[PDB]
Amino acid sequence: AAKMGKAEILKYILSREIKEKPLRSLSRKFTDWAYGPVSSSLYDLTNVDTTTDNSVLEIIVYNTNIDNRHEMLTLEPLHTLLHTKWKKFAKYMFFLSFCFYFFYNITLTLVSYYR
Amino acid sequence: LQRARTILEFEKMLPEWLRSRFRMGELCKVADEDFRLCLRINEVKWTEWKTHVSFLNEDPGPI
Amino acid sequence: AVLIAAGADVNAHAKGVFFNPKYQHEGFYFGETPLALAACTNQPEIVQLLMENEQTDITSQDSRGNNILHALVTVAEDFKTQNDFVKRMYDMILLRSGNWELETMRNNDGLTPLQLAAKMGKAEILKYILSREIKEKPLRSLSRKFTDWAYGPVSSSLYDLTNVDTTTDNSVLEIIVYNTNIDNRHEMLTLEPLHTLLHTKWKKFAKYMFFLSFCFYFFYNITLTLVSYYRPREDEDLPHPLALTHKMSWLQLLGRMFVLIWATCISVKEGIAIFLLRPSDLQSILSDAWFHFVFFVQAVLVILSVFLYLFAYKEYLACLVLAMALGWANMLYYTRGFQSMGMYSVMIQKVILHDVLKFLFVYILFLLGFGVALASLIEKCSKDKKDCSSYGSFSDAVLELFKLTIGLGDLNIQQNSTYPILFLFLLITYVILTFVLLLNMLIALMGETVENVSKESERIWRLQRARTILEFEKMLPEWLRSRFRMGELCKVADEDFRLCLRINEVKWTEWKTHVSFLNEDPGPI
Amino acid sequence: IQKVILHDVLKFLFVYILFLLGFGVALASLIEKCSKDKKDCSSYGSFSDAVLELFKLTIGLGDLNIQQNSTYPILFLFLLITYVILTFVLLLNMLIALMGETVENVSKESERIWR
Numbered sequence: 001a002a003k004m005g006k007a008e009i010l011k012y013i014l015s016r017e018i019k020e021k022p023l024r025s026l027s028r029k030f031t032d033w034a035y036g037p038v039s040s041s042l043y044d045l046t047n048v049d050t051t052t053d054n055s056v057l058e059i060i061v062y063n064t065n066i067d068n069r070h071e072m073l074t075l076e077p078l079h080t081l082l083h084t085k086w087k088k089f090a091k092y093m094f095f096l097s098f099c100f101y102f103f104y105n106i107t108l109t110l111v112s113y114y115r
Numbered sequence: 116l117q118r119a120r121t122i123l124e125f126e127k128m129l130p131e132w133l134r135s136r137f138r139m140g141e142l143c144k145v146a147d148e149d150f151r152l153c154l155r156i157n158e159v160k161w162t163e164w165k166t167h168v169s170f171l172n173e174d175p176g177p178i
Numbered sequence: 179a180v181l182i183a184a185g186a187d188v189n190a191h192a193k194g195v196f197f198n199p200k201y202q203h204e205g206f207y208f209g210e211t212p213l214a215l216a217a218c219t220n221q222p223e224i225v226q227l228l229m230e231n232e233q234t235d236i237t238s239q240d241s242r243g244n245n246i247l248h249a250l251v252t253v254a255e256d257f258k259t260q261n262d263f264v265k266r267m268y269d270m271i272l273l274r275s276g277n278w279e280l281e282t283m284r285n286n287d288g289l290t291p292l293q294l295a296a297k298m299g300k301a302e303i304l305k306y307i308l309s310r311e312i313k314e315k316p317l318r319s320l321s322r323k324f325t326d327w328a329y330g331p332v333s334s335s336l337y338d339l340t341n342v343d344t345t346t347d348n349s350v351l352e353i354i355v356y357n358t359n360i361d362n363r364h365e366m367l368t369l370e371p372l373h374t375l376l377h378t379k380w381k382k383f384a385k386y387m388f389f390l391s392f393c394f395y396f397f398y399n400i401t402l403t404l405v406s407y408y409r410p411r412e413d414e415d416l417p418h419p420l421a422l423t424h425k426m427s428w429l430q431l432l433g434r435m436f437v438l439i440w441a442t443c444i445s446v447k448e449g450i451a452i453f454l455l456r457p458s459d460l461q462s463i464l465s466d467a468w469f470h471f472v473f474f475v476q477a478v479l480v481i482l483s484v485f486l487y488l489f490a491y492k493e494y495l496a497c498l499v500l501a502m503a504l505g506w507a508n509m510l511y512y513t514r515g516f517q518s519m520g521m522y523s524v525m526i527q528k529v530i531l532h533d534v535l536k537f538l539f540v541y542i543l544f545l546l547g548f549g550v551a552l553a554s555l556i557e558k559c560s561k562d563k564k565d566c567s568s569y570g571s572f573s574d575a576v577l578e579l580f581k582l583t584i585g586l587g588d589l590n591i592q593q594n595s596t597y598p599i600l601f602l603f604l605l606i607t608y609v610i611l612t613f614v615l616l617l618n619m620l621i622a623l624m625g626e627t628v629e630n631v632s633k634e635s636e637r638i639w640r641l642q643r644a645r646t647i648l649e650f651e652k653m654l655p656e657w658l659r660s661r662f663r664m665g666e667l668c669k670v671a672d673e674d675f676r677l678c679l680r681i682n683e684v685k686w687t688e689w690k691t692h693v694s695f696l697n698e699d700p701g702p703i
Numbered sequence: 704i705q706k707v708i709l710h711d712v713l714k715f716l717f718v719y720i721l722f723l724l725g726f727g728v729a730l731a732s733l734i735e736k737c738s739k740d741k742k743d744c745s746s747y748g749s750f751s752d753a754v755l756e757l758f759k760l761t762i763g764l765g766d767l768n769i770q771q772n773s774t775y776p777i778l779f780l781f782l783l784i785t786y787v788i789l790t791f792v793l794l795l796n797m798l799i800a801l802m803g804e805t806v807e808n809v810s811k812e813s814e815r816i817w818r
């Protein structure tokens with residue numbers, strides 16, 4: 001479904017929640033607790049995070065064939081998962097890549113202007 | 116979408132011991148003899164009032 | 179119902195940390211009592227069942243001092259997210275209580291439920307309270323809006339001004355104008371008693387104090403300009419004219435004395451105002467205290483140039499010229515006295531922040547980047563003739579590319595370059611990026627900005643004028659505050675005298691027999 | 704033409720003249736006397752002369768010489784670039800965008816106004 005860009009089916013599978021008791025273990029979304037209007041849910045990450053090969057997240061980002069990649073990344077477990085990777089490690093590696101490339105351009109400029 | 120490609124390219128050049136330090140999700144028991152890694156999202160809904168029946172924990176705090 | 183009949187305590191307080199959460203997603207605050215829980219979860223039949231029991235204490239307070247009405251204000255949200263149940267729960271509990279005990283109670287911050295709604299920006303609840311009108315006879319004195327007379331489609335109403343006008347501390351009007359936290363101040367000032375009240379203050383005193391502030395600041399800039407343009411330019415005529423360092427009995431000497439005195443008065447007045455309203459937020463520095471900052475810098479540069487001449491350090495002339503240029507630019511503050519020019523100044527502020535700053539960042543990158551590459555391609559000109567290239571250094575190349583952008587001068591492609599074809603390639607690439615792409619895209623992006631903010635620019639202007647009105651009101655003497663008095667004293671109920679504001683109205687669509695009124699005879703009496 | 708003059712052009716001219724006359728006095732009072740050996744050492748030598756130079760810059764005629772007879776040459780260049788940003792980048796481009804809003808509204812009614 002991720003490979004062929006079927007966004008309606010993909011939304012249904014990633015957030016499937018079965019409240020009936022004998023078939024509850026077929027869910028991928030679970031309610032952990034609730035009180036009044038407030039609740040907290042858990043989303044299954046088994047074959048969607050990048051800990052295995054050909055995961056759902058990797059297939060969507062690198063899929064040059066389909067035309068709706070930027071709509072499929074709005075879906076519910078994928079959006080928070082990219083946010084968590086940016087906050088923990090990815091924002092600091094991006095700043096360090098900027099600093100090394102800036103110092104590379106400064107030095108190349110100064111040795112060419114002051115020949 | 117452009118920033119997402121930058122994130123996954125940074126993730127592949129990390130050593131395997133450092134991939135284990137930055138770990139998305141928590142190990143949870145969702146059913147009898149069924150342990151899955153899960154991601155937590157909170158929510159507030161004011162429009163559909165129902166009696167809550169299906170839950171994993173009776174006590175609703177951060178535990 | 180089975181538990182209450184068997185002796186369950188109807189006054190218990192759930193006071194744990196889950197019921198008083200530090201962050202929003204970790205719990206659910208509702209006011210800690212069983213009556214408040216049933217109201218906040220939209221259960222109107224349990225609320226009715228609880229209030230009929232005579233053991234239920236309807237006026238109790240929780241750990242932070244909130245009663246039942248404070249708690250409903252805290253959980254309220256707008257119509258798209260929550261519908262209108264919270265407003266309906268407020269009305270049902272208030273009428274059952276039957277007096278003014280609940281709405282005059284203060285929490286641990288010292289706030290009534292009316293003050294708390296203004297502080298938290300709850301616009302739906304605030305609209306309901308300010309215009310509450312109860313037509314049923316025994317509960318009529320709980321109203322804040324009264325019908326004075328009516329005849330056919332024409333009627334005249336009175337609005338209670340008790341804790342909303344600025345005659346007391348922490349009034350509703352003052353809380354809304356100075357609330358830098360919320361994002362909907364300019365929507366809340368459209369509400370019914372607040373809008374006419376600002377109109378009345380402008381007509382009676384505030385429009386005349388605004389004109390007098392303009393005249394004094396204009397004469398201050400005229401005199402500062404004339405004594406700086408007409409300095410004694412002679413080397414032998416040393417003394418600076420400002421403040422009369424050599425008393426010479428010259429007529430019109432008082433303008434040179436006016437500038438030194440008036441610059442001190444600005445620097446004290448703006449020194450106090452920046453102290454009392456200090457922002458912890460850069461968006462509030464630009465949206466409230468901008469013209470406090472730039473009037474203060476201008477007055478300091480005038481005082482600082484006086485000390486530099488009296489010690490003769492020659493840098494006094496630089497401080498004077500920066501003070502003149504900033505002074506005439508500061509005249510744009512006074513456009514907010516008109517609707518047409520005031521909305522135009524709102525547009526200027528939005529276009530600078532959304533469009534102009536992004537353009538300047540990319541343009542300077544292209545200017546400095548192409549500037550070094552062209553300058554390092556030019557050979558030495560120490561041989562026979564001088565003046566063989568205008569791109570001979572980095573400073574010279576940047577100046578030539580800047581003049582090309584604004585279209586001044588001439589273009590010579592015959593420089594002293596080692597590679598003349600490569601020189602022309604880089605120069606044409608610069609023209610395409612700036613003349614064809616970036617300047618034309620700036621015009622198109624401004625068209626999108628103008629379309630969005632034109633919907634809101636009238637309400638943003640009225641918020642700016644409202645801050646000017648309340649600042650003028652605080653500098654009046656107490657005997658003169660009594661002369662300009664909003665409202666009239668009216669008898670709205672038996673032994674109940676309130677200050678009220680009158681608003682007239684014509685309604686052609688709902689025909690009814692008029693029953694509730696304060697006066698049988700409908701004229702101006 | 705009548706609607707654009709009244710709604711857009713008159714507001715532009717008021718703010719432009721304030722910037723023109725205000726920056727004109729400040730630049731002119733920074734220029735030294737030219738009574739010594741050579742004449743014609745500055746084109747900003749008076750208030751009338753400085754206003755003419757800033758007007759020609761706006762409509763793009765002539766040449767630009769930053770080497771005047773200023774006491775403080777860096778301060779002279781700072782005020783001149785600030786004038787360019789306020790008029791060339793901000794006010795002239797915003798005028799085009801505001802005319803687009805005026806054309807959209809009055810095009811609905813312009814046939815009935817003509818009749």
Ligand SMILES: CCCCCCCC/C=C/CCCCCCCC(=O)O[C@@H](COC(=O)CCCCCCCCCCCCCCC)COP(=O)([O-])OCC[N+](C)(C)C
Pocket residue numbers: 464465466467468469472475500503504507510523524525526527528530642785
């Ligand atoms: C401290 C010196 C500042 C200027 C320095 C220049 C470079 C630094 C630039 C820094 C970034 C600029 C961003 C400014 C954003 C807000 C501007 C603004 O208020 O827009 C207003 C337009 O009228 C103006 O005042 C704008 C004109 C530009 C400033 C004048 C240039 C200086 C002139 C001479 C140069 C001498 C400089 C001498 C000192 C170096 C209208 O806005 P508003 O809708 O009414 O809402 C704000 C008002 N409110 C907050 C009360 C509600």
Ligand SMILES: CCCCCCCC/C=C/CCCCCCCC(=O)O[C@@H](COC(=O)CCCCCCCCCCCCCCC)COP(=O)([O-])OCC[N+](C)(C)C
Pocket residue numbers: 530541542573574576577580583776777780781784785787788789791792
């Ligand atoms: C698309 C159009 C827009 C373009 C805009 C950007 C384009 C910028 C264009 C730049 C072209 C000018 C540089 C060429 C070099 C000339 C020589 C020179 O004197 O350089 C000197 C440095 O000069 C400076 O430091 C410049 C000072 C102004 C800085 C930017 C203005 C701030 C605007 C804020 C207002 C914001 C408004 C408020 C916001 C609402 C030193 O070099 P030198 O070799 O030693 O020279 C001899 C020195 N001597 C002269 C004393 C003897």
Ligand SMILES: CCCCCCCC/C=C\CCCCCCCC(=O)O[C@@H](COC(=O)CCCCCCCCCCCCCCC)COP(=O)([O-])OCC[N+](C)(C)C
Pocket residue numbers: 088089092093094096097100128129130
């Ligand atoms: C907890 C957060 C940090 C955790 C991870 C940190 C360790 C790193 C993890 C793994 C090691 C890195 C593998 C190879 C590195 C090669 C470097 C290189 O060629 O540049 C690469 C940047 O590469 C970067 O990731 C930027 C940071 C430099 C890493 C240097 C490691 C030492 C740490 C710091 C040393 C002392 C500094 C101390 C600073 C205080 C190329 O950049 P690019 O963006 O990939 O490609 C260009 C853009 N493009 C896509 C358009 C083409």
Ligand SMILES: CCCCCCCC/C=C\CCCCCCCC(=O)O[C@@H](COC(=O)CCCCCCCCCCCCCCC)COP(=O)([O-])OCC[N+](C)(C)C
Pocket residue numbers: 382383386387388390391394443444447448469470473511653654655
């Ligand atoms: C019935 C209607 C009138 C009733 C009230 C009248 C009495 C006054 C009431 C109270 C007294 C005033 C208190 C202090 C005054 C200090 C002056 C000063 O520093 O300038 C202040 C203006 O201040 C003004 O209000 C403008 C009018 C000057 C008041 C002078 C009183 C004598 C009256 C006239 C004398 C003879 C003239 C005769 C004319 C025919 C500063 O202006 P600002 O706007 O506050 O701040 C700058 C803008 N900013 C916010 C961006 C920073």
Ligand SMILES: CCCCCCCC/C=C\CCCCCCCC(=O)O[C@@H](COC(=O)CCCCCCCCCCCCCCC)COP(=O)([O-])OCC[N+](C)(C)C
Pocket residue numbers: 380385386387388389390392509510512513515516517
């Ligand atoms: C225009 C100059 C061009 C050249 C300037 C160059 C720089 C340009 C810089 C900025 C451009 C803007 C310039 C500022 C304009 C003036 C301020 C103002 O707004 O006045 C306003 C009111 O003020 C009046 O009452 C009108 C003046 C009548 C005389 C009253 C004198 C007061 C003394 C009496 C007491 C004596 C007490 C003293 C002794 C005790 C006019 O606005 P309005 O729209 O008519 O108000 C109605 C608004 N409403 C309909 C929405 C409700």
Ligand SMILES: CCCCCCCC/C=C\CCCCCCCC(=O)O[C@@H](COC(=O)CCCCCCCCCCCCCCC)COP(=O)([O-])OCC[N+](C)(C)C
Pocket residue numbers: 515516517518519
């Ligand atoms: C074309 C004939 C041939 C040439 C004739 C040449 C000579 C012509 C002489 C005089 C006519 C000059 C204009 C005066 C009338 C403007 C009307 C207007 O819309 O004002 C508006 C603002 O506009 C201002 O008033 C702001 C200041 C403008 C500067 C002129 C001072 C006004 C007093 C005149 C003294 C003269 C000083 C200037 C001397 C040149 C009114 O403000 P507002 O009501 O709050 O906002 C409107 C929005 N609303 C309608 C929905 C509420």
Ligand SMILES: CCCCCCCC/C=C\CCCCCCCC(=O)O[C@@H](COC(=O)CCCCCCCCCCCCCCC)COP(=O)([O-])OCC[N+](C)(C)C
Pocket residue numbers: 460461531532533535536538539
């Ligand atoms: C000019 C004189 C020097 C000033 C320098 C420092 C001034 C900076 C101080 C204050 C302005 C910073 C923003 C604070 C308020 C945010 C609101 C906003 O509109 O920002 C916008 C622009 O912001 C950017 O991201 C542009 C990137 C660079 C801006 C700063 C460097 C100036 C570039 C070279 C200039 C030097 C040239 C000098 C020589 C020619 C964010 O983009 P947005 O999405 O459209 O915002 C929508 C609103 N929102 C945030 C709520 C979503």
Ligand SMILES: CCCCCCCC/C=C\CCCCCCCC(=O)O[C@@H](COC(=O)CCCCCCCCCCCCCCC)COP(=O)([O-])OCC[N+](C)(C)C
Pocket residue numbers: 109110113539542543546547550571572573574
């Ligand atoms: C408050 C903050 C706002 C300030 C303004 C805003 C920030 C503006 C940012 C930067 C402005 C200044 C840039 C640094 C260079 C200094 C210039 C210099 O000193 O010239 C000297 C060094 O010149 C060189 O060595 C060659 C150039 C080196 C830097 C390469 C520029 C490309 C950067 C591209 C990306 C940069 C930007 C990226 C996008 C933003 C020599 O030059 P000269 O011609 O031989 O001098 C003759 C006189 N003299 C012989 C007596 C000495």
Ligand SMILES: CCCCCCCC/C=C\CCCCCCCC(=O)O[C@@H](COC(=O)CCCCCCCCCCCCCCC)COP(=O)([O-])OCC[N+](C)(C)C
Pocket residue numbers: 596597598599600601603
């Ligand atoms: C995917 C495709 C995109 C990229 C494609 C390339 C890949 C990039 C990789 C490498 C770059 C290849 C150049 C090698 C470096 C040599 C430079 C050199 O010698 O200067 C040469 C000029 O050079 C130019 O003017 C053109 C350079 C850019 C070519 C790319 C065209 C861009 C498309 C736009 C198409 C229109 C542009 C055509 C404009 C001519 C000649 O030097 P000279 O000054 O003549 O010698 C002195 C004069 N004399 C003869 C009297 C003795």
Ligand SMILES: CCCCCCCC/C=C\CCCCCCCC(=O)O[C@@H](COC(=O)CCCCCCCCCCCCCCC)COP(=O)([O-])OCC[N+](C)(C)C
Pocket residue numbers: 517518519709710711713714716717
């Ligand atoms: C040009 C020659 C000298 C003329 C001077 C006197 C001419 C004045 C005579 C008549 C025009 C005045 C308006 C009367 C009719 C109102 C309709 C209107 O569109 O006005 C608008 C502009 O009005 C302003 O407020 C602009 C502020 C200054 C205008 C007057 C000074 C000119 C500035 C310097 C020029 C001198 C430059 C000379 C040297 C270069 C009001 O804004 P609006 O909200 O968009 O209006 C919508 C319609 N409404 C009112 C129904 C709401």
Ligand SMILES: CCCCCCCC/C=C\CCCCCCCC(=O)O[C@@H](COC(=O)CCCCCCCCCCCCCCC)COP(=O)([O-])OCC[N+](C)(C)C
Pocket residue numbers: 403404407506717720721724725728749750751752
């Ligand atoms: C019908 C109404 C429409 C009329 C047109 C529209 C109205 C236009 C408004 C104004 C136009 C005229 C401005 C007044 C100055 C007179 C100029 C002068 O006489 O020069 C003399 C005085 O020059 C000086 O003393 C220095 C400048 C003083 C005023 C400061 C201007 C800043 C105002 C900023 C805000 C103002 C605007 C605010 C926004 C609107 C000397 O100058 P000179 O170079 O040495 O002369 C040489 C020849 N001579 C030696 C033989 C003598």
Ligand SMILES: CCCCCCCC/C=C\CCCCCCCC(=O)O[C@@H](COC(=O)CCCCCCCCCCCCCCC)COP(=O)([O-])OCC[N+](C)(C)C
Pocket residue numbers: 475493496497500774775776777778779781
């Ligand atoms: C909240 C922050 C906003 C406000 C910040 C400041 C607060 C305002 C409060 C006080 C103003 C501070 C200046 C003190 C007065 C001294 C003036 C002076 O001596 O002239 C100086 C130049 O001066 C300049 O060119 C820059 C002046 C404006 C600086 C503000 C930058 C605006 C942001 C835009 C950033 C880019 C702008 C950078 C452009 C350089 C030097 O004089 P000179 O001509 O060199 O001397 C003769 C030449 N000689 C050396 C050969 C012998």
Ligand code: NA
Pocket residue numbers: 584585586762763764
């Ligand atoms: Na031109």
Ligand code: NA
Pocket residue numbers: 585586587763764765
């Ligand atoms: Na030209």
